[PDB]
């Protein structure tokens, strides 16, 4: 292989003999593979070695092997962070890979924590920073690689970049700065708008994300557009939520209205109210619709606006009071049943509309077998109990099962009293059917749907806090996907000063793992390093 | 609780219950509960022909029982 | 099992609700028969419900609910 | 999770213990004479 006797020294890391080799006309030259003495230091972590053949020609600190990696590669990539900080104090270049791969990601992909630290708190970490792949399939940029691989390295470097400054007693004398130029990527494809935010709810970085500088980049990216953004929104929907609203308090139901005012003696008296409210009402319902020109909540929106034409249609051509009311009352229960989904982007509102929504989901799932049982109950019901007026008819005996399934059975006026004046026609089989459908429905049925909802919420409460903040910074996202150019850098900021006084298992298992693998490779060394001290030692005693 | 309760006033605004808008709001608090008179509310109106939207009175109850007294109990009773 | 209970009632009481076919019997009777039988068919349709894979889990909560029932059923029926 | 500590000290101790023999090791290698199989 081409190997120098000076690359087996340095390989391992034998100074003494390294110097002897050096001083008396040593030649650098290079193995097999393009290796060399400094590369194979760097694989071995031998310090000592590094320092004493770096300081004779200055020439071999940045040499390409067959793979094109250097003495640094191996240095980051093996874990040796002493061995890096001493390559990289003497004036060590950083060359990208033949794979597009430096050290510093080669460093990430292997889960060095010092040797990244050391690389963090080197006087040259941004310019390690600057120089990365663009375009390559994989060895993204540092930060996300450090986001996805070694999140307590990230947690350093961004208490780095707490900026705790005026650490001078509780007097009101705090200053204290966020930076936040490590939270956006460095190298300038398509504009990503939060890439390291993305990055830590994609890997469920809840320790991560809950740092102070993170927090505090959402904060100032919601009062910089998101706070704007949302009030633009329910402002367009209150413009018809709300005067639908004084319309129905204001005007007694089942009674028809125009313009002028009350048509069913005319009233005149909030004439003005009344017609401002239907223009207001006609308004926000063709903006919506103008808005869907250009999923469930369409279908709500759509019966929304329907709803909202047919109720404030008298203002051009008279239509029946019946038609009116009843479209809407199904435009403001509508209406308020969306506003209900238009809560939904809030840090206090949020996780209980996602409650609702998956205890809703479990409902219609069970849906099928509570219909089923609700027939059987109620055709039993309406054969046993013909002869009153809740079970007269089959949707009404099955409407009433309904009703009754809350436990609201009503025992005595159905049963009690019908028996004890003989005007049940099958008086042991209803009592019968009557206990068990106590026993089936209100208490088995509710017990069932009670531990379904215990089942879900506990779930929904597993990643309370990561859902937040993934909805918080999808909107975010999506609001800076919306605004092209001139906003983002109009509200753009890097920084901001803030006055605080106002004038663990998966982790630690895997560290015990990779140090039984040292463990593992260093007695494997061990062993081949005590079988030659069997095959090469000498005995002149016992020879048998 | 405003929707069901403005939805009820409008459906059912000839009875004393819901005759008023806060009246109407009270009255879906106080059958939150499951006490959802029913009968009284529902049926008797409905033979008598003094329901104004039978159909949608109906489907608003069956939308209000599986909604506020189960989804919402529910919900409450796995927080706490 | 109490699949074959089930569906034995609901033969029986199917026989007996159309028996008019052949042989005339009192309305009581028929009636009574008829609604024991409309009842166990939905009861026996939910467990043929249960060879599905939306439904089945629902149908085994069911099972355990009801089995826990009629353990604590004789401390119930004490009280 | 005091468990789990100990389990890591103790290998981290392993881990230590490890190092100084396998110097040790290189120590005898590096001192040892051979006069048989010199080549």
Same mark, same amino acid.
């Given at each position: 292989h081409g190997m120098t006797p000076l690359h087996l020294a340095a390989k391992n890391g034998h100074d003494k003999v390294v110097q002897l080799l050096l001083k008396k006309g040593a030649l650098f030259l290079s193995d097999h593979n393009g290796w060399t003495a400094l590369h194979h230091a760097s694989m071995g972590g031998y310090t000592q070695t590094m320092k004493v053949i770096l300081? &004779?020609?200055?020439?071999? %600190?940045d040499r390409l092997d067959e793979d094109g990696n250097t003495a640094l590669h191996f240095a980051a990539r093996e874990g040796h962070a002493k061995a890096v900080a001493l390559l990289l104090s003497h004036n060590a270049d950083i060359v990208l890979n033949k794979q597009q791969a430096s050290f510093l990601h080669l460093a990430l992909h292997n889960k060095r924590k010092e040797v990244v630290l050391t690389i963090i708190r080197s006087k040259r970490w941004d310019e390690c920073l600057k120089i990365?792949?663009?375009?390559?399939?994989?060895?993204?940029?540092p930060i996300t690689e450090m986001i996805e691989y070694l999140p307590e390295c990230m947690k350093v470097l961004l208490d780095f970049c707490?900026?705790?400054? &005026?650490?001078?007693?509780?007097?009101?004398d705090y200053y204290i700065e966020y930076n936040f130029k490590y939270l956006?990527?460095?190298?300038?494809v398509i504009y990503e708008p939060l890439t390291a935010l993305n990055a830590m709810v994609q890997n469920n970085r809840i320790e991560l994300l809950n740092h102070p500088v993170c927090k505090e980049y959402l904060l100032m990216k919601w009062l910089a557009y998101g706070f704007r953004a949302h009030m633009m929104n329910l402002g367009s929907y209150c413009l018809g939520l709300i005067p639908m609203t004084i319309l129905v308090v204001n005007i007694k139901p089942g009674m028809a209205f125009n313009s002028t005012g009350?048509?069913?003696?005319?009233? &005149? %008296?909030n004439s003005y109210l009344i017609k401002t409210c239907m223009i207001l009402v006609f308004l926000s319902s063709i903006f919506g619709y103008c808005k869907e020109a250009g999923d469930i909540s369409n279908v709500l929106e759509w019966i929304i606006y329907t709803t909202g034409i047919i109720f404030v249609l008298p203002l051009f051509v008279e239509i029946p009071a019946h038609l009116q009311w009843q479209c809407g009352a199904i435009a403001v229960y509508f209406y308020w049943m969306n506003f209900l989904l238009y809560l939904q982007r809030f840090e206090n509102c949020g996780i209980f509309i996602v409650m609702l929504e998956v205890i809703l989901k479990t409902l219609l799932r069970s849906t099928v077998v509570f219909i089923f049982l609700l027939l059987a109950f109620g055709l039993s019901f309406y054969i046993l109990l013909n002869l009153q007026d809740p079970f007269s008819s089959p949707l009404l005996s099955i409407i009433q099962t309904f009703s009754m399934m809350l436990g609201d059975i009503n025992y005595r006026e159905s049963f009690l009293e019908p028996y004890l004046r003989n005007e049940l026609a099958h008086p042991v089989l209803s009592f019968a059917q009557l206990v068990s459908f106590t026993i089936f429905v209100p208490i088995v049925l509710m017990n069932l749907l009670i531990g379904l909802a215990v089942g879900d919420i506990a779930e929904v409460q597993k990643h309370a806090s990561l859902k937040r903040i993934a909805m918080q910074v999808e909107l975010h996202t999506s609001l800076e996907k919306k605004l092209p150019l001139w906003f983002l850098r109009k509200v753009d900021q890097k920084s901001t000063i803030v006055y605080?006084?106002?004038?663990?298992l998966e982790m630690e298992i895997l560290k015990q793992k990779y140090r039984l693998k040292d463990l593992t490779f260093l007695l494997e060394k061990q062993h081949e390093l005590i079988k030659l001290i069997i095959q090469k030692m000498e005995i002149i005693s016992e020879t048998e």
């Open positions: 300081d &004779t020609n200055l020439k071999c %600190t990365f792949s663009h375009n390559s399939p994989g060895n993204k940029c707490m900026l705790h400054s &005026t650490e001078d007693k509780s007097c009101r956006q990527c460095p190298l300038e009350i048509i069913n003696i005319l009233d &005149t %008296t605080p006084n106002k004038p663990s």
